[PDB]
């Protein structure tokens, strides 16, 4: 089954934008884009990435969501950017590994789950980060329309 990913994400962000206190910025197209992934799996992917962005963010920092369309590859690129503590250069591609944490204390599965779910549905995921400036997590999903 297919879901309209723009609507879907807006509602996810809305439930985060409306609870407690933190800013949320959007680069989301007025386009009818569909992905074939169960609601609950894509929810876990996004919840896990958003949870990290907020957990590791300071001040009234911005979390920015983007969806960009690669028509040639038939892929959407979905990204979550924060202005948080960032990730050490040597660790940036360890962060998706099961139980891996940058520093007894914590689980370290959020991003492993996100990777497994994205990959199972034909996408890929990566982290771009500068220690002390912030992190972008980006994943792809096949789409139609």
Per CB under 6 A, residues contacting ligand ATP are 48, 52-53, 56, 82, 84-87, 95, 100-102, 106-112, 135
Max CA pair span of the chain: 46
Question: Which tokens go with 105?
Answer: 């204390």
Tell me how far, at minimum, the Cβ of 114 lies from Mg ion, in Å: 9
Tell me how far, at minimum, the Cβ of 95 lies from ligand ATP, in Å: 4
φ and ψ at residue 68, rounded to 5 degrees = -120, 145
Tell me how far, at minimum, the Cβ of 106 lies from ligand ATP, in Å: 5
Q: Which does 107 bind (CB under 5 to 8 A by kind): Mg ion, ligand ATP, none?
A: ligand ATP
Binding region for Mg ion (CB under 5 A): 52, 110
Tell me how far, at minimum, the Cβ of 87 lies from ligand ATP, in Å: 5
C-beta atoms surrounding 38 within 10 Å = 12
CA–CA gap between residue 64 and residue 25 (Å, rounded): 4
- Do 140 and 133 meet the contact criterion of CB atoms below 8 Å apart? no
Q: Which does 61 bind (CB under 5 to 8 A by kind): Mg ion, ligand ATP, none?
A: none
Residue closer to ligand ATP by CB (options 57, 140) is: 57
Q: What 3-state class would DSSP assign to 46?
A: helix
Beta strands per DSSP E along the chain: 2-4, 24-27, 34-36, 63-70, 75-81, 125-130, 134-144
Q: Which does 109 bind (CB under 5 to 8 A by kind): Mg ion, ligand ATP, none?
A: ligand ATP
């Amino acid at each position: 089954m297919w879901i309209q990913i723009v609507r879907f994400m807006s509602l996810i962000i809305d439930r985060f934008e409306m609870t407690k206190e933190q800013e949320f910025i959007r680069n989301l197209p007025d386009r009818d884009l569909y992905v074939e992934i169960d609601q609950d799996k894509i929810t876990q992917v996004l919840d896990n990435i958003i949870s990290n962005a907020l957990k590791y963010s300071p001040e009234g920092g911005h979390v920015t969501f983007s969806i960009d369309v690669n028509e040639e590859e038939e892929l959407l690129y979905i990204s979550v950017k924060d202005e948080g503590i960032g990730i050490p250069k040597k660790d940036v591609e360890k962060v998706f590994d099961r139980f891996y944490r940058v520093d007894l204390g914590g689980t370290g599965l959020g991003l492993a789950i996100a990777k497994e779910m994205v990959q199972a549905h034909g996408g890929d995921i990566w982290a771009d980060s500068i220690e002390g400036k912030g992190t972008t997590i980006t994943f792809t999903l096949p789409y139609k329309e």
